[PDB]
Amino acid sequence: HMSIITDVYAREVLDSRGNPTLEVEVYTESGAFGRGMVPSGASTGEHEAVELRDGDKSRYLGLGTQKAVDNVNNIIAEAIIGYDVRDQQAIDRAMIALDGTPNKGKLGANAILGVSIAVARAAADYLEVPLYTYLGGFNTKVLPTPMMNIINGGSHSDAPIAFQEFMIMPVGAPTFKEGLRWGAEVFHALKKILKERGLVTAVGDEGGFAPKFEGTEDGVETILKAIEAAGYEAGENGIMIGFDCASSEFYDKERKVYDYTKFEGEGAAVRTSAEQVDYLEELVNKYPIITIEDGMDENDWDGWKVLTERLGKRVQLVGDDFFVTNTEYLARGIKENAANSILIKVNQIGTLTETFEAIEMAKEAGYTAVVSHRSGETEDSTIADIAVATNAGQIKTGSLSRTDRIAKYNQLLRIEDQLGEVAQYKGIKSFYNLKK
Amino acid sequence: HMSIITDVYAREVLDSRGNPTLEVEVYTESGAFGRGMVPSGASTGEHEAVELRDGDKSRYLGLGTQKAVDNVNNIIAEAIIGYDVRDQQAIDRAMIALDGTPNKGKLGANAILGVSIAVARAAADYLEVPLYTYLGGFNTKVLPTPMMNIINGGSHSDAPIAFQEFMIMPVGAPTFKEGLRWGAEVFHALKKILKERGLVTAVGDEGGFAPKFEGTEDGVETILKAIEAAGYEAGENGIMIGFDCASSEFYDKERKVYDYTKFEGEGAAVRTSAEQVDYLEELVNKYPIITIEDGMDENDWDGWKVLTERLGKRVQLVGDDFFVTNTEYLARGIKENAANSILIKVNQIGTLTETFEAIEMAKEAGYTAVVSHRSGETEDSTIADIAVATNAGQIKTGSLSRTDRIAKYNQLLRIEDQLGEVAQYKGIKSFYNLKK
């Protein structure tokens, strides 16, 4: 038919670290071939694209997702059928205003993401045309600019460091074909610094470091020296650096300040709201610095003003929790009048329709839509393809430790060659409203 | 040429930890565009298969595969048109004549494997059959068995241990689905202790760790005890383990004696050839083994003849560096009883048809085969379906706590869903080399 439906199939698969996910076959006869699934991460207690799990001993130690798959696999056969897969919106938006749960799922947020992923894929590679380029008109070309990691912290790290990560960028990059070498170099060349001086024997994350390092204020030698003779200049021109500070971790709501004495030593002073801000601004003033991420909790409604009050046209700040690409919060960013970037963790936004609506809504004013990877990932590059399709601009995928991220990078380069002529990056306009 | 295997299209792509590889596409005159790619790994000198890497030191320290991509596109593009409409062997096994070198370095084992995989994974393009069905056996319904690295070693060992990598093995699940869990459950049990241990929880990109013990009257006790606490039994009525000895290396070539003062503390203990096998005689019996990779050295000829006479039905003699998956080397082991099994490395052998033929010849000599993971881990899951195609089943699949390793099962659960009705679990009686 290619326009009517009377038959489909679906199933489940495993994911990274052992959080299996969905897998649905929405083909028409033997007239379609592709794949459909979604990454995942198990949690609760927040308005995420929260994920539904089984817990039954038979369902892979209680970590199976067949129970959430059952909401689709039990009540279809030939009963509810009658809608088509060509109509992207008929699946995307006719569904939400039937359940309307606040945290994005009763039958499954990951289910509703993977299902529409399959919907998009069901004829993408059929058309013999790239996936990103055909979901509306023809207007998706830009590979999201990758921001790379150099440090990690918290319980995601082997050593006691607070800030969840520090990040640098290839702002000098001409094109992705050649640029693929730069990021791989920054990861390969993380074993030759210590000798100039005599330093510590510890290991680290996907390509960031977790050292037994005495104090936060000194984190310079392990990074700047492994910026210079990482193969590249460091200084404060030509090359940039960035940070990240795990917004919704800790807030002394009982006293209207923050705290950072969790990881500061017992001999340290009280780091505050303003001591946090001014300590980042210290490197904003006399360090090559543009990009920042997180630091302020789900509700730091007024606090998101602050990092763009005086840290004005000199930086760009990503906010995970209060933005999460969610529609209501993405609107309230305007109500606060001072948002500047957003985090687009794929399993925080749900359907692709809302994904692109919110992405364009943000990027209209210059927001850099950072589509960020997740622990539980599959062999498909659906997330980076979505980022390309929605012309997000920025992508956060850690470093080259994991082949499932290497797969995203490879698929995006394949895409670049299918494009042919895309040596594109927007220069200083990549962060846009900047003159410092 | 309405039905002639006409066109190809390869490219250069990536794999684990920033190493380039190659991807191939073969087009039929029916509507095919199929994609497929191969992992990375290279050597030189003896008969071992060899990659062709770009001489430009910029392209990943000279690890660029663009020259292999050219060997495909500028040479094979004219050697595929006009040939037979349907002939698996004639189509695929004819690349050594074109290369002119036995090790296949001039054209490339990776490129040759990609060329083969393109047509072999053309199922939905036009074959009407799955890959396992096509590659030489029609109605196989065989399922995998993981040997996984969770504790590192070998080259990383300043401690009083040597072992290159511990492989834990599941054997005795009630039915074919439950075998996956029976092997996957152990990494969680190891993590149960390691995190509270802290004794350098160094994480390798395999997904494992590198812990240390102190001495005897406990060192190994925890292997038995932790799985007891988890409840899983031990032995060929339970969980069994296998070791990658890395014998061919540790056996100092300049001295030719298994002197283990190399990795252990300086002292007295030393093992010779006539005294090594008592190492296993004391180890295996209280801590059972299932699979041993390259049980002992290749420069030790007269002395492989104690293990197969003492425990020669319980200790699988998996030969990797004894065979290098090559036809001539495998025939060597066959000719005069140097082992009883083969480790497969598809990127070493070169083609799916060569892998199938090698497994067929191993079956003819009573040798069980095992596909194995390689350093450059792909996202394409073709490399592992050949084992199910030839009923080899077992696979070395890194550590299942990561996506590079999970993707293979994420693929093969589709095969497990497709057995038919006749999949009664052979299980502990699957072996034909063992339990003669």
Side-chain angles (χ1 to χ4, degrees), chain A residues 9-18 23 25 33 35 37 57-61 63 125 155 158 177-178 180-181 184-185 187-188 191 203-204 375-380 400-407 409 411 413-414 417-418, chain B residues 11-19 23 25 33 35 37 58-61 124-125 156 177-178 180-181 184-185 187-188 195 200-203 205 376-381 400-409 411 413-414 417-418:
Chain A
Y9 188 62
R11 77 172 66 76
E12 165 194 84
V13 303
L14 301 184
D15 283 3
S16 309
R17 316 211 91 184
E23 175 169 73
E25 332 309 354
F33 87 117
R35 192 53 30 200
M37 24 182 101
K57 289 192 285 280
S58 184
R59 300 261 48 93
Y60 199 77
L61 296 70
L63 313 182
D125 301 72
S155 299
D158 193 21
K177 173 187 157 189
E178 207 276 318
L180 191 68
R181 174 179 61 74
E185 281 195 19
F187 172 87
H188 287 296
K191 325 273 271 184
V203 292
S375 294
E377 279 287 350
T378 64
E379 68 261 47
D380 38 50
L400 280 79
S401 175
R402 251 198 202 69
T403 206
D404 44 299
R405 298 73 147 107
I406 299 298
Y409 282 12
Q411 170 52 23
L413 179 51
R414 293 207 197 98
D417 281 331
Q418 281 168 332
Chain B
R11 62 177 61 72
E12 170 170 39
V13 284
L14 288 189
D15 59 22
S16 67
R17 296 210 293 178
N19 274 8
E23 160 159 277
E25 298 160 356
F33 262 144
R35 265 205 262 261
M37 61 100 94
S58 309
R59 312 192 94 261
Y60 303 80
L61 310 173
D125 294 347
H156 259 261
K177 173 162 64 68
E178 301 295 303
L180 154 63
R181 177 165 68 87
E185 285 210 43
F187 178 83
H188 309 304
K195 269 293 200 78
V200 283
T201 72
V203 200
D205 84 333
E377 281 303 331
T378 63
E379 86 293 38
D380 193 338
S381 305
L400 330 179
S401 57
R402 245 175 73 157
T403 321
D404 359 61
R405 291 82 198 190
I406 285 286
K408 280 66 167 175
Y409 280 88
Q411 170 72 350
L413 45 88
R414 310 180 182 128
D417 206 10
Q418 293 168 338

Side-chain angles (χ1 to χ4, degrees), chain B residues 200-257:
Chain B
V200 283
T201 72
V203 200
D205 84 333
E206 337 313 315
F209 318 85
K212 299 183 182 176
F213 297 160
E214 177 168 24
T216 311
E217 173 136 11
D218 59 355
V220 63
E221 207 158 13
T222 294
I223 295 181
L224 293 211
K225 279 301 190 190
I227 303 187
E228 181 57 37
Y232 268 24
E233 293 85 343
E236 197 211 311
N237 204 0
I239 274 57
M240 253 204 184
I241 308 99
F243 308 159
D244 159 0
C245 302
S247 55
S248 302
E249 304 278 23
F250 292 173
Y251 195 76
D252 193 3
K253 189 168 280 194
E254 289 299 333
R255 302 183 293 137
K256 306 179 184 177
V257 58

Side-chain angles (χ1 to χ4, degrees), chain B residues 332-343:
Chain B
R332 217 176 187 192
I334 293 171
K335 203 152 68 84
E336 285 214 325
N337 187 9
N340 278 266
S341 178
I342 181 161
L343 201 79

